[PDB]
Amino acid sequence: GPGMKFKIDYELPLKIRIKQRVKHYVEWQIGYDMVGNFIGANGKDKKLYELSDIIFQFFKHNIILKENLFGIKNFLENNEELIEDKMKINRTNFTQKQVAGINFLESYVSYPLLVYQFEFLSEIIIGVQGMLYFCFPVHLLKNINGERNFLKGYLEISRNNINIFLEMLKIFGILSNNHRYNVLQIIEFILNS
Amino acid sequence: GPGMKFKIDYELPLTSVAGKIRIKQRSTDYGLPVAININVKHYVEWQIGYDMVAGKNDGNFIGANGKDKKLYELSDIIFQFFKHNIILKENLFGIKNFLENNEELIEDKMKINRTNFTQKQVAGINFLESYVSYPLLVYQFNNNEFLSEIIIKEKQRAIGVQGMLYFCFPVHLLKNINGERNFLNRSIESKEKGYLEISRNNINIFLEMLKIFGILSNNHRYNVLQIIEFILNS
């Protein structure tokens, strides 16, 4: 349907990993671009993909207002608090530890992780790099025919859950400087188009 | 040379990435990798093994996993120095009796920790923050130049933790192709090889490393015990 009736049945092959803690969920290492619509932070030909493809279509069908994209743009342009700079890896001081009578020095390396709850949730784990994972129960997916008969999958996106992907784009925009630059280029492309 | 003069100039590929040999710089503690003149803080990181899967003709023992195995790197070094009568039989027997009586295993005592959550706000966005803490064990050999570090990670597709042993020592200890220790204050040439001199003066470092492998897990204990028995009966 057009306008507010617009939906996307996103095909998900079964970057996709299936794990379990009804406890089984989809682990989607979702991206926003692909190697053209804009110039990435690395200076390569980048085009819209996945997350940005979803936002562009729902903006094209007038479900996402341009005022929302303007607010996200100004938020990402004005913000200086980035997740990569706020997530610090900690290393403890070496302490004496004996195993099997052998004297070792023991230290712990702690890697932070962030959980954003939207039932959906986003997880950011950790040279090193931060990796974003969009997670949701697997029984939410419709089969190839079009019914949740799992308890290829298809994730239904509509006006009732598009805000999950707008929030996820905003989170990407504060993950790192490279992501902040790329997301700003994507929002500029969507607003101009 | 012959007898007590026996040595091994172990060839180590220096300019190589995505392999068992890596070059890092020790930050006065911890170290960070490097890609360039070599100074005293540059170390060799060697993810050394003690065996290798063998074929139907070159097998030396059967490992804990039931696979054909043969000597490799650490165990081959110990075999040659035992073959040339530098390593005493009592040294191998002492390690054998130690591994037979030992009950504390590294993969059973080392724990990966997940901390409680805390509320964390970044850019005005509220998150739940937690930490995953990985232990590492460092063993300082009697020679203050050599050390080994055991990194503890999760078992892949299994329950528990696994240890990866790395053998570390300064780059300036290595000899070039001419037998010169001239790496200090000099950049490493392309495809250049470093040579770690192993002799009677430092062989016990490799014996202590074999003992450390033997306490890593029950499978490692079994494999080391099979290696000691094979070497003793040679």
Numbering used by the authors:
A (entry chain B): -2 to 11, 17 to 23, 42 to 55, 61 to 143, 147 to 154, 162 to 186, 195 to 236
B (entry chain A): -2 to 25, 28 to 34, 38 to 236
From the paper:
The most striking difference between R.PabI and R.CcoLI is that R.CcoLI cleaves the DNA backbone at medium temperatures, while the DNA backbone cleavage activity of R.PabI is very low at medium temperatures; R.PabI only hydrolyzes the N-glycosidic bond of the recognition sequence at medium temperatures. Both R.PabI and R.CcoLI are members of the HALFPIPE superfamily of restriction enzymes. Structural studies have identified that HALFPIPE superfamily proteins are not restriction endonucleases, but rather are restriction DNA glycosylases. However, at medium temperatures, R.PabI acts as a monofunctional DNA glycosylase, while R.CcoLI acts as a bifunctional DNA glycosylase. R.CcoLI is predicted to recognize a negatively charged dsDNA in the HALFPIPE region, similar to R.PabI.
The R.CcoLI structure was determined at a resolution of 2.35 Å using the crystal of the R.CcoLI(C189S-D225N) mutant. The final model contained one R.CcoLI dimer (chains A and B) in the asymmetric unit. R.CcoLI consists of five α-helices, fifteen β-strands and one 310 (η)-helix and forms the characteristic HALFPIPE structure using strands β3-β2-β5-β13-β12-β11. In this region of R.CcoLI, three catalytic residues of R.PabI, that is, Tyr68, His211 and Asp214, are conserved as Tyr52, His222 and Asp225, respectively. In the R.CcoLI structure, the insertion residues of R.CcoLI forms an antiparallel β-sheet (β6-β8-β7) adjacent to the active site. However, in the R.CcoLI structure, the side-chain orientation of Lys71 is flipped to the active site due to the insertion of the R.CcoLI specific antiparallel β-sheet. The model structure of the R.CcoLI-product DNA complex shows that the distance between the side-chain amine group of Lys71 and the C1′ carbon atom of cleaved deoxyadenosine is approximately 3 Å. In contrast, the results of the DNA glycosylase assay of the K71A-D225N mutant showed that the fraction of cleaved DNA was highly increased by NaOH treatment. This result indicated that the K71A-D225N mutant of R.CcoLI functions as a monofunctional DNA glycosylase and that the side-chain amine group of Lys71 is important for the DNA cleavage activity of R.CcoLI. In the R.CcoLI structure, this region shows relatively high temperature factors compared to the protein core region. Although the structure of R.CcoLI was determined in the absence of DNA, the R.CcoLI structure is most similar to the R.PabI structure in the sequence-nonspecific dsDNA-binding state.
